[PDB]
Design a protein around this ligand. Structure first.
Ligand SMILES: Nc1ncnc2c1ncn2[C@@H]1O[C@H](COP(=O)(O)OP(=O)(O)NP(=O)(O)O)[C@@H](O)[C@H]1O
Lengths: 14, 333
């Protein structure tokens, strides 16, 4: 979802 | 035929290089390399044909997951079973490989408010599709929320889903109080309650309503929500359940910000609406998605619903084995 909508990557480790 | 932790996995030659992932109460899950699509997948082995309840779980999960198509719901890529019904004793269900689940994550790390928001959004976006198909999942819990490193989430484990209870389950901590009060006539609101429990557990890394049985679980629920109001007692129609509630000592409500002093106040407002004792006043999935806490994700143009809603418990295990054989025939060469 985030990638398709152009939002920055959200990683589990952060 | 390759073996994993003593159990056989007869999935070759298409799937190879097995690696143990884990086990639920009904299946053993490994990863494998799919030599057709040239990627690693997950494979769940089920051996259900000896018991009525096992067969039901297998048939329900396969019939539903084969007909669902949604980004936040696990799919079935393939199903392996013997070419004859007499030789069919195991079923192997092949799915997209995910990296972990929310249960295992919450045992290891804090979730930031950004994580919690994004996971909650995806749970409800998936649930919006499920409920639009007129299906109840009925067993939402952290262990069946699959996750990958980019925080994509998929709901899995539909063995208890029904179109809108005595069997064994690994955990009852996410079940709605109206299930425990034998109110019957369960609705989509039981899924919202479970999501409420999962949200609370993301905020604190602890289950909010643990308990050794329903009586103990209800005491945990009432110890936080407080004793039900007069109006709440009217939604409990079962004679014995209502008398039981009336027999309990009065308990005060605990403010959410005392239990979760570091949580986003918007998250607590939405939590309050999901963990509403009265199932008729509990928030519905569409209203939950529109809640201010999820404002950066609510996007009704990008939240698909089922094109059409869906519209067995008295069948013997031999008849269910037939139906299982039939629904899986499409994957045979
Ligand atoms: N597609 C998958 N990708 C990665 N891990 C998975 C996948 N499916 C299941 N798992 C892991 O294996 C565990 C058991 O899976 P589940 O699908 O929940 O099993 P069950 O035995 O059929 N039902 P339950 O008793 O409710 O767990 C899950 O909790 C996940 O950690």
């Amino acid at each position: 979802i985030r990638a398709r909508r152009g939002l920055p990557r959200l990683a589990v480790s952060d | 035929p390759e073996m994993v932790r003593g159990q056989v996995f007869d999935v070759g030659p298409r799937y190879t290089n097995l690696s143990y992932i884990g086990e639920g109460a009904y299946g053993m899950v490994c990863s494998a390399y799919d030599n057709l699509n040239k990627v690693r997948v997950a494979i769940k082995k089920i051996s259900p044909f000896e018991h009525q309840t096992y067969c039901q779980r297998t048939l329900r999960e396969i019939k539903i997951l084969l007909r669902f198509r949604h980004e936040n719901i696990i799919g079935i890529n393939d199903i392996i079973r013997a070419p004859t019904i007499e030789q069919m004793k195991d079923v192997y269900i092949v799915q997209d490989l995910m990296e972990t689940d929310l249960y295992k994550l919450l045992k290891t790390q804090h979730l930031s408010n950004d994580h919690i928001c994004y996971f909650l959004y995806q749970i409800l976006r998936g649930l919006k599709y499920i409920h639009s198909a007129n299906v109840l999942h009925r067993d939402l819990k952290p262990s069946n929320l699959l996750l990958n490193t980019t925080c994509d989430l998929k709901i899995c484990d539909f063995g208890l889903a029904r179109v809108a209870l005595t069997e064994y389950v690994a955990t009852r901590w996410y079940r709605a109080p109206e299930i425990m009060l034998n109110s019957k006539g369960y609705t989509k609101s039981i899924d919202i309650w479970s999501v409420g429990c999962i949200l609370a557990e993301m905020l604190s890394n602890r289950p909010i309503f643990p308990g050794k049985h329903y009586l103990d679980q209800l005491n945990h629920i009432l110890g936080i929500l407080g004793s039900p109001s007069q109006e709440d007692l009217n939604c409990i129609i079962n004679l014995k359940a209502r008398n039981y509630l009336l027999s309990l000592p009065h308990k005060n409500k605990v403010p959410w910000n005392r239990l979760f002093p570091n949580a986003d106040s918007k998250a607590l407002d939405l939590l309050d609406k999901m963990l509403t004792f009265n199932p008729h006043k509990r928030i519905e999935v569409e209203q939950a998605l529109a809640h201010p806490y999820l404002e950066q994700y609510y996007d009704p143009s990008d939240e698909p619903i089922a094109e059409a809603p869906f519209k067995l418990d008295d069948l013997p295990k031999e008849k269910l084995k037939e139906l299982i054989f039939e629904e899986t025939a499409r994957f045979q060469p």
